[PDB]
Design a binder for this molecule. Structure first.
Ligand SMILES: Nc1ncnc2c1ncn2[C@@H]1O[C@H](COP(=O)(O)OP(=O)(O)O)[C@@H](O)[C@H]1O
Ligand SMILES: Nc1ncnc2c1ncn2[C@@H]1O[C@H](COP(=O)(O)OP(=O)(O)O)[C@@H](O)[C@H]1O
Ligand SMILES: Nc1ncnc2c1ncn2[C@@H]1O[C@H](COP(=O)(O)OP(=O)(O)O)[C@@H](O)[C@H]1O
Ligand SMILES: Nc1ncnc2c1ncn2[C@@H]1O[C@H](COP(=O)(O)OP(=O)(O)O)[C@@H](O)[C@H]1O
Ligand code: BEF
Ligand code: BEF
Ligand code: BEF
Ligand code: BEF
Ligand SMILES: [Mg+2]
Ligand SMILES: [Mg+2]
Ligand SMILES: [Mg+2]
Ligand SMILES: [Mg+2]
Lengths: 370, 187, 316, 370, 370
């Protein structure tokens, strides 16, 4: 059985091909302790990874080795893969072929280092590097659709028709759940709460999951929030202090539809989706509008399917039905899709075998993977 | 001259009262307030007025009151307040109707000049009368419009939201040398 | 506001008050509207009973194009003998009133919607006859051009709906064409009106708004209206034509389209006024920058330090 | 003296007839501030146009009002004509008759609206709307030749013999220097340089101008640059950071010869020129191959004359001369040709005059111009 | 005239707009007595404010009503504003508009209660609440730059280009001169000397203000003070006894460049400045790098401009010039800049007026002051 490992910017989702859910799901984090280690022994390690670093976060300077789907710190990244195989999945990777993933428009150097580390240190027998928004479409069980993926580090559209991607119509946008968390820290400062350490940024990341939502009509929800008590919700910090939060619940996710909130020039995810469909060749558009497959954890906000469907219906010509397809498991669907693709009997000829890496070097990956 | 019912507008500092001559109450009585914002330019189309502009303080508009102490003193806001009064609420065509406007006795000539050029050049109304407001308020006292019910001599004390003034009128003539005005009232 | 309401606001607000009211007072209220129309609202027999009545100079033409059957369909039991001096009248009883707050809301809307319900009759005659011609043309596509040719001259509606206008419309198997023979008599509105009508035609020729009716314009008339009464080519009229195709009056759209096409000339008349309110706020911006070109002629002297009310002050 | 404007789809060139080169050349750009002004006293201004917008661009969102040689935002195009008249040339538009310039096979509505604006908004005394390629033969001193014009927005061939144009054999292609900037921004991401904003587009336009070239054989130049650093160059961003550029130095201009790089289905500029000559009458082909004239800034890449001569010599019959005349002033040759045309003694009868326009409306333009 | 009242967290700085420098500078302190008030009569007061408290401090519990630039204690902050207007400036506040200030990224309620107390207690005729790092840029004679303001309670960066602020790139750090004072008590404790009380915290502030300086190279300064007499010197207490100090003189200021000393996870002030420049759009970064502006009293350490220029030149690309602007009057530049602003003729249109507050309520400041 092959491994499937979605190297996400916020969560590593990993497991075995042909299982129907990820086996490991943990923060894509390395943490090093930032304080005087006064006590001899006590189980101390020079660095903590994933759920250890999340459990001990009060004593650690956490950092993510991934920024916008690009591995920025390779020495921290080897520790995450080592932890994934040996501690979290508990299998020697030298015996099992692995399907990795990345976003479109990544640097080629990212993919070359990633394949070199996988052969030249973990000795993986064969491996592959799928485009994340192709995997999502296998999880939905479709050949035609426009995959809106938004994660922790990136948002991207790939339109695909009858199994062919239109690579000229790929739109990528470096705004995702990390930037919405840093923006939620910003706007929480106006309500009176200060979150600033990388351990406190994880509490703001947790408020974002449990309280935030997408306002179906933003300026009507602003007028409602400014004139009501019933919009507000309260959250227990790890301290037992209770915070309360209001119009800040929908102003945070509304950054996806107004990237000018975080100072960006980009059009929002409704317009960069429509600008991908309107970059396709004309006859496929009618089948893309009826198959907007959403994926990645940033699409989990309550009301994002309805706001997305309302906004694209206001851009698109009115004589045709829009359907935003939001599966209930969409959070993991890039991994679920990898679990199908790595299992397909027609796919198991497409691996990079280590014999090919041994003759060609890491530049094998560009002539074997999309 | 046109025969159509003259339109009547008492723009107070507190309330504008709007209507058509010969009706038994104003068609509208609402605050003299305008809600304004504080790739084509439209910030001069996005405004609201009256009872529908109090609802807008929470939607992030700035309310301002373009009449203060009985006098119009923002002419951008008052022009937009009149266009919206005429074309949304009164729903009339200015070229068909005579208008009665009102102002206090001691208003500056500059405000009657600005009122006249807005009415004749912006809206193009058929004709205009700018009545001294307390001179009219005597005529509300009568038991009826008929000549035997009139009592054309009396002091009239007017006090709105922004000015109080006392006008003596006798035998139907306003004794202008004796008007008293004090910009202290309901606000 | 960016675009006009279709209903008369006053009758909507007034009936929304009386339908909520625990204790109605009497009223007597004439109320003007666009296109020379005029309502009268009053409580003649009791405070309990509101008579709404309408006056409109072209109503005799609208009765020829089937109006009374449309008004009897809409207002039903509330229809009343026309009030003396008015074309149509409706008597609504506040004790016999509908039950729910959403029935009250849609009745107060429906009664305030009277101008566009009386002026809708020639449009429903054209839409329902285009639905017959669409079936006859689908029976014989080689006969269809001749059905269109005869309906273009036999089924044509003209309404002289105000003295400086005419609306002319006719069905053909795939469309309703409507022509506004439109004129601005006020000369400062005629000067801006050339810009507003020209840029309206030039707007339809852009990729963004191709979904809209095909608009066309001239100043002489379309070939199929050149012999209608009151249409004259020389008198500085402009002839804005809309072609509504079967997709512009599909069953979900018909009522908005009737409501929205009648108000055409009134949005241009409103926006010509509301453009003077724009040019003024843009002029007084350039005046405030010419101030700076004169301010460099005043010699630099500090005006003395003063309290907020302008009284003199003694510190620093 | 008449005016002449080539309202280019990316640079405005403007000046007076009988001058040797444009009086004013500036970006066909309008920019509006994206941020909030906090300083008082500063000369806050609601829109900048031309070189002032290009200079202040770090705080502006920049729009081009012409897309593929078609004016698409008229309000920001009226600003640009007001900038050409009152600020750059600084002559009132009523004083001088004025030659405008347009691409072939444009919308009729584009040339009507450009006539209606000039007579009814700028009140000009007379005007004419010449085809951009017909002016390139005047600049080149020819009366027989096939033009290959290529600008920011559009590329087109107009074949002409003894002054008779062949309007059935015009080939027009909505691929030129803008789509090469859009593609260079995309492939720059593969080396790790993310350029995203409408102002970073103007840095990537400058990289394209300073460093790119057309390689005489692409598969050979690719195999060369894959082995070596010798083809690389480096460019200092306005940030003081240096980017370094590889085979994307010449894989960018190859889009002209291989439009399938940007996903679009069309003949490259070599085959589209040969197809234009093969549509022409057989006796004239023998002279169109001998008088092949280039124009417009996208024809400025080093080696594009040798690439174009190599490809036409491979398509056309070997028994006859292929001779490409790409002159060194060709960057402005549409304007230079317009300044000759508007200066002719025999052209002064051909203007559309104001008195002749208002008896006919803007539909006069299609019955005096080509 | 209008008052300019920069109620900073360590010093109130107050005076009149267009005056040269602040005429009322005093501790932002309210002192209350802590002892048996035995002598009847004697001119005793229930609390003391400013220099009246600072001079009596040996019997008072001194407390600042303001912490990290946020008002914590309004009943004492009204006491400081009342002292400012009636005792220190000797005006009637109902006669003069006040320009107040606050740091960016403050609570909304801070700005509301600060307008409400000015209109409802001090009865002020009009008022405004400027951002302190905008004011510091007027006081530099500039319309673009990156102000590093650092006071007693807050350090913040505000990048500005052509008078537009880039609010997404604003950095706040809750570290300034009071944390350096609390750290100087923690390290003075190691040599022999204990300072504990709120009054003794002022003695060590008066050490910090004249013994401390910033090392140009801390790790080599540390070796030099550990091997020579030259870095040591002494200070004489109120009790006449002498305090001698050495590496404490530069370890204290170094907390700004290394916040890890006081247990904070953050960038230092040098890397916080660079993280603000690198958040800005790419074309403005050169004009920010050549216009860093130091401001506020924590930037007064001897050698901090030389150190700041060294550390930023190591982070910035070596291709481009760095300047740190640090006037000798940077001690008061936020007040100096408010005194410019409150005298500019367009500014008299921008005040919140009494009548406008009465009609709009205290939320008017959120839709007029930014
Ligand atoms: N229920 C949720 N509601 C809102 N956001 C969520 C939710 N669950 C996860 N997220 C956000 O989604 C991101 C993780 O999504 P994921 O698809 O796993 O990204 P990635 O693949 O790049 O690691 C994080 O920023 C996280 O906070
Ligand atoms: N019963 C009342 N007692 C006192 N004041 C009243 C009463 N009813 C209304 N007002 C006040 O009357 C003023 C409005 O009067 P109005 O004649 O409309 O003034 P204006 O013409 O200047 O707007 C407001 O101050 C309002 O609060
Ligand atoms: N030296 C050059 N090398 C390569 N490309 C160039 C050069 N000079 C200009 N360009 C490109 O050519 C285009 C401008 O050419 P121009 O003829 O003025 O086009 P247009 O007339 O349509 O505005 C831009 O895309 C520009 O970047
Ligand atoms: N010469 C100096 N050397 C070091 N620190 C100084 C110096 N002068 C003032 N400070 C410190 O600056 C702080 C006061 O600065 P200020 O800008 O007025 O802060 P705030 O605006 O917040 O009140 C105090 O911590 C003070 O000790
Ligand atoms: F890297 Be995650 F997909 F944003
Ligand atoms: F303005 Be009100 F008449 F006092
Ligand atoms: F005008 Be450019 F040549 F498109
Ligand atoms: F409050 Be000071 F500016 F730190
Ligand atoms: Mg992901
Ligand atoms: Mg009054
Ligand atoms: Mg050109
Ligand atoms: Mg300060």
């Amino acid at each position: 059985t092959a491994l499937v490992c979605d190297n996400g910017s916020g969560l590593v989702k990993a497991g075995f091909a042909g299982d129907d859910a990820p086996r490991a799901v943990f923060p894509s984090i390395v943490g090093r302790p930032r304080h005087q280690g006064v006590m001899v022994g006590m189980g101390q390690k020079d660095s903590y990874v994933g759920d250890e670093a999340q459990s001990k976060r009060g004593i650690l300077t956490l950092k993510y080795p991934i920024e916008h789907g690009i591995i920025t710190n390779w020495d921290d990244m080897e520790k995450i893969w080592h932890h994934t195989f040996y501690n979290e999945l508990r299998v020697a990777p030298e015996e099992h072929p692995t399907l990795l993933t990345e976003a479109p428009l990544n640097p080629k150097a990212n993919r070359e280092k990633m394949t070199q580390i996988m052969f030249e240190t973990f000795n993986v027998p064969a491996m592959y590097v799928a485009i994340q928004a192709v995997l999502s479409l296998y999880a939905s069980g479709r050949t035609t659709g426009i995959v809106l993926d938004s994660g922790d580090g990136v948002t991207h559209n790939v339109p695909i028709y009858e199994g062919y991607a239109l690579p000229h119509a790929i739109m990528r946008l470096d705004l995702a759940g990390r930037d919405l968390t840093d923006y939620l820290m910003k706007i929480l400062t106006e309500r009176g709460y200060s979150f600033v350490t990388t351990a406190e940024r994880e509490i703001v990341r947790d408020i974002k999951e449990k309280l935030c939502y997408v306002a179906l009509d933003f300026e009507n929800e602003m007028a409602t929030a400014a004139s009501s008590s019933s919009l507000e919700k309260s959250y227990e910090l790890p301290d037992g202090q209770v915070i309360t939060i209001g119009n800040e619940r929908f102003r945070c996710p509304e950054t996806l539809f107004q990237p000018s909130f975080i100072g960006m020039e980009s059009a929002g995810i409704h317009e960069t989706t429509y600008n991908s469909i309107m970059k396709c060749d004309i006859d496929i558009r009618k089948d893309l509008y009826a198959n907007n497959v959403m994926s990645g954890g940033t699409t989990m906000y309550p009301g994002i399917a309805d706001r997305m469907q309302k906004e694209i219906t206001a851009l698109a010509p009115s004589t045709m039905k829009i359907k935003i397809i939001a599966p209930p498991e969409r959070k993991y669907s890039v991994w679920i899709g990898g679990s199908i693709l790595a299992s397909l009997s027609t796919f198991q000829q497409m691996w990079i075998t280590k014999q090919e890496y041994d003759e060609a070097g890491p530049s094998i990956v560009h002539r074997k993977c999309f | 001259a046109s025969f159509n019912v003259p339109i009547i507008m008492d723009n107070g500092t507190g309330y504008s009262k709007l209507g058509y001559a010969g009706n038994d109450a104003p068609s509208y009585v609402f605050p003299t307030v305008i809600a304004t914002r504080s790739k084509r330019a439209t910030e001069d189309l996005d405004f609201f007025i009256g009872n529908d502009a109090l609802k807008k303080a929470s939607a992030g508009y700035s309310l301002d009151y373009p009449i203060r102490h009985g006098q119009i003193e923002n002419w951008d806001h008052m022009e937009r307040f009149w266009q919206q009064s005429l074309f949304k609420y009164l729903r009339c065509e200015p070229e068909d109707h005579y208008f009665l406007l009102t102002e206090p006795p001691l208003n500056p000539p500059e405000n009657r000049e600005n009122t006249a050029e807005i009415m004749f050049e912006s809206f193009n109304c058929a004709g205009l009368y700018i009545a001294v407001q307390a001179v009219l308020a005597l005529a509300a006292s009568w038991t009826s419009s008929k000549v035997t019910d009139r009592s054309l001599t009396g002091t009239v004390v007017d006090s709105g939201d922004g000015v109080t003034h006392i006008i003596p009128v006798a035998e139907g003539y306003v004794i202008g040398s004796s008007i008293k005005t004090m910009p202290l009232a309901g606000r | 506001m960016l675009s006009l309401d279709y209903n008369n606001i006053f009758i909507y607000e007034l009936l929304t008050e009386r339908f909520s009211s625990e204790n109605p007072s009497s009223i007597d209220q004439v109320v003007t509207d666009f296109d020379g129309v005029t309502f009268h609202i009053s409580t003649p027999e009791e405070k309990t009973k509101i008579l709404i009545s309408l006056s409109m100079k072209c109503y005799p033409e609208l009765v020829n194009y089937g109006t009374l059957d449309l008004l009897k369909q809409i207002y039903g039991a509330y229809v009343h003998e026309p009030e003396m001096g008015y074309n149509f009248s409706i008597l609504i009883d506040l004790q016999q009133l509908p039950a729910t707050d959403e029935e009250k809301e849609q009745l107060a809307m429906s009664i305030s919607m009277l101008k566009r319900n009386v002026l809708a009759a020639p449009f429903h005659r054209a839409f329902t006859k285009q639905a017959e011609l669409a079936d006859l043309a689908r029976k014989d596509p080689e006969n269809a051009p001749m059905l269109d040719k005869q309906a273009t001259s036999q089924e044509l509606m003209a309404i002289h709906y105000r003295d400086e206008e005419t609306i002319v419309l006719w069905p053909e198997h795939d469309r309703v064409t409507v022509v506004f023979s439109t004129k601005f008599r006020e000369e400062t509105d005629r000067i801006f009106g050339k810009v507003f009508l020209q840029e309206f035609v030039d707007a339809r020729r852009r990729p963004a708004i191709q979904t809209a009716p095909q608009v066309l314009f001239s100043y002489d008339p379309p070939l199929e209206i050149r012999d209608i009464q009151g249409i004259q080519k020389g008198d500085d009229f402009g002839f804005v034509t809309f072609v509504l195709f079967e997709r512009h009056f599909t069953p979900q759209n018909r009522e908005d389209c009737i409501s929205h096409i009648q108000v055409f000339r009134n949005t241009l008349h409103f926006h010509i006024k509301a453009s003077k309110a724009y040019m003024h706020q843009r002029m007084r911006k350039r005046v405030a920058d010419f101030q700076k070109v004169l301010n460099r002629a005043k010699p630099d002297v500090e005006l003395e330090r003063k309290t907020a009310t302008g009284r003199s002050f003694v510190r620093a």
